[PDB]
Write a protein that binds this ligand. Structure first.
Ligand SMILES: *[C@@H]1O[C@H](CO[C@@H]2O[C@@H](C)[C@@H](O)[C@@H](O)[C@@H]2O)[C@@H](O[C@@H]2O[C@H](CO)[C@@H](O)[C@H](O)[C@H]2NC(C)=O)[C@H](O)[C@H]1NC(C)=O
Ligand code: CA
Ligand code: CA
Lengths: 4, 65, 298, 303, 4
């Protein structure tokens, strides 16, 4: 996925 | 020194020759057989028994005296 | 009792008749040992054999008449040493050079930079082992002076179905530029363009920070990702990381497909995922990345 | 006086009848082995992706497990299978010789010694790759070329039948090509086994000890006499007598390509020609012990 | 071994  | 003691003399050294020769052939075959484990489908599971050869070898010598 | 003196002569020549008998047998047996010897010189037959034909790549090889899938030495124009590969060759004369494989999780894909550069895993003639060919090789195979190349990705779920996704003008740069992934365009396929990025739904920027085109290669010990943390460390792989990934074919092998957030230590999804085909919590059963000159892909 | 003649005819009869039987047990077994030899043993060694010039390049390229690898020392020659040892002393060790059971014949002619023989590796069981080594001689042509690539060190390891193990390290190791009768040269010894190769048999004396130095020797095999034993008599050649090819002097302090005696202890009336053939390293166990494991491993040398 |  992505990240914060 | 009689005709037949001469005949018994030669056998005593013919069988000592053969007892060393067999003992050898025995070892030889065990190694040669094991060395087929690396090329043949299987190698016969076996064990040498020198005791049998070494027993008779002492027994022979006793009776050569 | 003690045998007779006249018995002694019959008895004496009987022993000679068996000593010589023995002797003769001993000579015949030695001779038979000698014959057993010539039977025990060859080694065990190794079933895995490397094919004779060689070329610049699997497509070159296949054009030289090669008919069947197996292990081949290839040597791209700009390479020093030749190297072994798996070539998949179909009925139409297509020779795919396979550079990545997953299927049983037998191989641990958490490898360092050198390891992804040189390669790890094993090649098998039946094409049934997990491997990473090595970046350096991949770079060489895909950058031979003016030969447009194509990558196919092949997925398989834990339910039978499989899906492909193609990419024209595929290319991996030198170590200089951290084995950069570039392609002209998505060439079609019912797995979906996961290198374009994926709208994950955790942020408006996702679609960009998960695209892979242009990404440099990253391992835990060589961080080259667009994220101030460590994609390859956390997600425990070597991949073309952004911030971090929409597709993750070098991910951790999850048996069954379904895995959860609690399955992982660092909270993030580290499995073999391809976001356009399945959820970021479904890890593929089979994974294969292979390349072929573009002019060959119809 | 007269008890002796029949006492012989009793015992001599017994022994001969005993042997007749021993012959039959042996005829049986050879019959059997021949039958099994109508079909080969097999392996399936999936080749590791990572390759290199030799096992040290591979270890540095990230190949950390001890298995069979495909090396290519030079572009001129085609790649070949070798077993790399990655665990022993920082790894990167290329096995050129290996003994562990009696699976492979080592009493071979010149050509097989030149080409290499035996099994490089077998399947680890429950696995598709071959992570155990076979008994093999790599081959002189290959061994020569490897050592002349640059400073090459030699590591000889060995184990007795009770589990104790020792080693005979050599800092420099070189083998010349076929035109030079694969002449050996070693230097810079350390280790626990005893310097059999440079010094000769630790237990012999003066000129006797000197005729067992291997350093500088030429490689000989039963069909090619290159030992330091100058005679007119065909049967008086070390490779004929000590069984299998080696850098024999007159004849040896160390015989790693000898005949594999099961058990360890063996004696002169057990030996084919009475000479101490078999996996001998006199400097450790003497002339009449025959190692359970024996291996020669090479690696490039860094001071 | 040796050999004299
Ligand atoms: C070199 O060795 C020979 C032979 O000795 C052999 O090895 C010994 C360790 C021991 O096991 C012997 O039984 C082996 O035969 C030595 O032979 C000498 O021969 C002469 C001639 O008959 C004899 O008079 C000597 O007594 C023998 N040696 C002795 C004193 O036992 C020879 O002396 C050795 N010479 C060197 C260079 O040390
Ligand atoms: Ca980073
Ligand atoms: Ca000679």
């Amino acid at each position: 996925g992505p990240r914060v | 020194v009689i005709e037949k003691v001469q005949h018994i003399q030669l056998l005593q050294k013919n069988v000592r020759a053969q007892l060393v020769d067999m003992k050898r052939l025995e070892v030889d075959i065990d190694i040669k057989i094991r060395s087929c484990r690396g090329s043949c489908s299987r190698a016969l599971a076996r064990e040498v028994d020198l005791k049998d050869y070494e027993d008779q070898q002492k027994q022979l010598e006793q009776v050569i005296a | 009792y003690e045998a007779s003196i006249l018995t002694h002569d019959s008895s004496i020549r009987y022993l000679q008749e068996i000593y010589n008998s023995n002797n003769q047998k001993i000579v015949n047996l030695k001779e038979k040992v000698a014959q057993l010897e010539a039977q025990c010189q060859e080694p065990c037959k190794d079933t895995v054999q490397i094919h004779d034909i060689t070329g610049k790549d699997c497509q070159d090889i296949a054009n030289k008449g090669a008919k069947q899938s197996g292990l081949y030495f290839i040597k791209p124009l700009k390479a020093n040493q030749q190297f072994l590969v798996y070539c998949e060759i179909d009925g139409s004369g297509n020779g795919w050079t396979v550079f990545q494989k997953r299927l049983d999780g037998s191989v641990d894909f958490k490898k360092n930079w050198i390891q992804y550069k040189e390669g790890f895993g094993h090649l098998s003639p039946t094409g049934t082992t997990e491997f990473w060919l090595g970046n350096e090789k991949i770079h060489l195979i895909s950058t031979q002076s003016a030969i447009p190349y194509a990558l196919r990705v092949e997925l398989e779920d834990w339910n039978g179905r499989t899906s492909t996704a193609d990419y024209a003008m595929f290319k991996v740069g030198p170590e200089a530029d951290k084995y950069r992934l570039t392609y002209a365009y998505f060439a079609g396929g019912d797995a979906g363009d996961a290198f374009d990025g994926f709208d994950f739904g955790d942020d408006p920027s996702d679609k960009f920070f998960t695209s892979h085109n242009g990404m440099q290669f990253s391992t835990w010990d060589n961080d080259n990702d667009k994220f101030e943390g460590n994609c390859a460390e956390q997600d425990g792989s070597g991949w073309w990381m952004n911030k971090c990934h929409a597709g993750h074919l070098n991910g951790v092998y999850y048996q069954g497909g379904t895995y959860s957030k609690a399955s992982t230590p660092n909270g993030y999804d580290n499995g073999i995922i391809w976001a356009t085909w399945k959820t970021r919590w479904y890890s593929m059963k089979k994974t294969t990345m292979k390349i072929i000159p573009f002019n060959r892909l119809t | 006086v007269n008890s002796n003649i029949p006492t012989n005819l009793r015992v001599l009869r017994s022994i001969l009848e005993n042997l007749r039987s021993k012959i039959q047990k042996l005829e049986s077994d050879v019959s059997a082995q021949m039958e099994y030899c109508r079909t080969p043993c097999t392996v399936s060694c999936n080749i590791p992706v990572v390759s290199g010039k030799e096992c040290e390049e591979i270890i540095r390229k990230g190949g950390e497990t001890s298995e069979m690898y495909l090396i290519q020392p030079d572009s001129s020659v085609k790649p070949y299978r070798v077993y790399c040892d990655m665990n022993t002393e920082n790894g990167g060790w290329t096995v050129i010789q290996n003994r562990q059971d009696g699976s492979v014949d080592f009493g071979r002619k010149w050509d097989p010694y030149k080409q290499g023989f035996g099994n490089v590796a077998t399947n680890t069981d429950g696995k598709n790759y071959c992570g155990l080594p076979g008994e093999y001689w790599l081959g002189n042509d290959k061994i020569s070329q490897l050592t002349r690539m640059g400073p090459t060190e030699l590591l000889i390891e060995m184990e007795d039948w009770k589990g104790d193990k020792v080693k005979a390290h050599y800092g420099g190791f070189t083998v010349q090509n076929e035109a030079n009768k694969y002449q050996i040269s070693v230097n810079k010894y350390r280790g626990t086994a005893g310097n059999a190769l440079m010094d000769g048999a630790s237990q012999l004396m003066g000129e006797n000890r000197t005729m067992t130095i291997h350093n500088g020797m030429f490689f000989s095999t039963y069909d090619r006499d290159n030992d330091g034993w100058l005679t007119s008599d065909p049967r008086k050649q070390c490779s004929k007598e000590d069984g299998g090819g080696w850098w024999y002097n007159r004849c040896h302090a160390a015989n790693p390509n000898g005949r594999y005696y099961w058990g360890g202890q063996y004696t002169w009336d057990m030996a084919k020609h009475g000479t101490d053939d078999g996996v001998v390293w006199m400097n450790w166990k003497g002339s009449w012990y025959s190692m359970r494991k024996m291996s020669m491993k090479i690696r490039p040398f860094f001071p």
